[PDB]
Curated annotation (Swiss-Prot), chain B:
This is Beta-galactosidase. Induction: By allolactose. The lineage of its organism: Bacteria, Pseudomonadati, Pseudomonadota, Gammaproteobacteria, Enterobacterales. The gene is lacZ. Belongs to the glycosyl hydrolase 2 family. Na(+) binds at D19. Substrate binds at D19. It comes from the Bacteria. Changing D19F: Obliterates all binding and catalysis.
Length: 211, 210
């Protein structure tokens, strides 16, 4: 969840907001080791419910998201149904466990390609154009993350927008991402330079991937 | 002596406007059929399966014309080559269908078949069905027959399945045409067509458009 002002700003300027519970368990092995453990359900519920209990009246919030990168575990299912029960005025989405789980009203892949299939086991990233027409699939497709704009990037962007306009159930996405996460440091002569991962003697680090 | 007055143009033609040469006449086989008075008038073969195609029930509905008698029976017997794998005998009189009862002049046979050999374009297995109409005491009146292939066609979850599996139709539209003979089809050409079709990796054909 964001600083309270932000939603009021989206309410007044005009932007659709996906409001996101503060839950990421990426580094876990496996990624759902927590979200599937029912001893972690309490801490998770409070992270979803207390969001819902805060921003439910902001018109700009049109979609609830259960979190990010946390595999798929029962807790997600229980907390999906909780919001569905508490607030029918918004669809609930979640990319975890394959971007089309029983935990999501919207097929929301991250970095699914337009035409090329990436058949990772258990969790494949199908081409968005192919994903829609899989046997028995009816949900819409809005990527929660796409077009990784890191340095000299956004090659092939065009391809998404042409597909988006052609396929009614392809309803676009959210670019990753808005702003560089570089930070100001100063040299020996007090002149400012933009720093990234590692530059604070912080180890281990993921270098320029924060930008 | 026969006299056949064939007209080129008819109200039929309005429903026969296919993209192809317009010709006319008696263009397929003519034949004479002697049936008994008490005769097999229709038969339907059905094959349904369990979930992994290891058990099948063949279901043959038989229809007759003539005067109904208690001594009448139909036997249906299924063959694989020259082994008889299953067989059913019953008198006429189908199940109760409504408030007036049932079809006195129909009988339905159900043959159980363990581990049937399935039919497909890959392996076109064929069993043979023999439909005998006969007096119970053992007099054959007439036998009719067909080739049977145990296969199941259905659309489930948006796919077209055959014997459980999703098909890939490598098909061709084929009109009945010959350069010398026009629209008169013969075995030699049909077979020539099939072998080439199968030689060039086809597994399906649409009867365009008749
Ligand atoms: Mg036409
Ligand atoms: Na669209
Ligand atoms: Na990053």
């Amino acid at each position: 969840p964001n600083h309270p002002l932000w939603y009021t700003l989206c309410d007044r300027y005009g932007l659709y907001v996906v409001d996101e519970a503060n839950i990421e368990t990426h580094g876990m092995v496996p990624m759902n080791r927590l979200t599937d453990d029912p001893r972690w359900l309490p801490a998770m519920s409070e992270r979803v419910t207390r969001m819902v209990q805060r921003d439910r009246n902001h018109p700009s919030v049109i979609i609830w998201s259960l979190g990010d990168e946390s595999g798929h575990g029962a807790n997600h299912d229980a907390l999906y149904r909780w919001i569905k029960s508490v607030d029918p005025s918004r669809p609930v989405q979640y990319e975890g466990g394959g971007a089309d789980t029983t935990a999501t009203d919207i097929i929301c892949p991250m970095y699914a390609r337009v035409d090329e299939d990436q058949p990772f086991p258990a969790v494949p990233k199908w081409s968005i154009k192919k994903w829609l027409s899989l046997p028995g699939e009816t949900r819409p497709l809005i990527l929660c993350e796409y077009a990784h704009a890191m340095g000299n990037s956004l090659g092939g962007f065009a391809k998404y927008w042409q597909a988006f306009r052609q396929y009614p159930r392809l309803q676009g996405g959210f670019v990753w991402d808005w702003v560089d996460q570089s930070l100001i440091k100063y040299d020996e002569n007090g002149n400012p330079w933009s720093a990234y991962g590692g530059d604070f003697g912080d180890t281990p680090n993921d270098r320029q991937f924060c930008m | 002596r026969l006299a056949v007055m064939v007209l080129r143009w008819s109200d039929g033609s309005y429903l026969e406007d296919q993209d192809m040469w317009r010709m006319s006449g008696i263009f397929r086989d003519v034949s004479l059929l002697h049936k008994p008075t008490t005769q097999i008038s229709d038969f339907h073969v059905a094959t349904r399966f369990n979930d992994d195609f290891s058990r099948a029930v063949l279901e043959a509905e038989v229809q007759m014309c003539g005067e109904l008698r208690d001594y009448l029976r139909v036997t249906v017997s299924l063959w694989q080559g020259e082994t008889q794998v299953a067989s059913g005998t019953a008198p006429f009189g189908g199940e109760i269908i409504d408030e007036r009862g049932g079809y006195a002049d129909r009988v339905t046979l159900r043959l159980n078949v363990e581990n049937p050999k399935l039919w497909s374009a890959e392996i076109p297995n064929l069993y043979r069905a023999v439909v005998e109409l006969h007096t119970a005491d053992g007099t054959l009146i007439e036998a009719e027959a067909c080739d049977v292939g145990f296969r199941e066609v259905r659309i489930e979850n948006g796919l077209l399945l055959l014997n459980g599996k999703p098909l890939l139709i490598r098909g061709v539209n084929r009109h009945e045409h010959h350069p010398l003979h026009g629209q008169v089809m013969d075995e030699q050409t049909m077979v020539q067509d099939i072998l080439l079709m199968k030689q060039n990796n086809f597994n399906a054909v649409r009867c365009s458009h008749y």
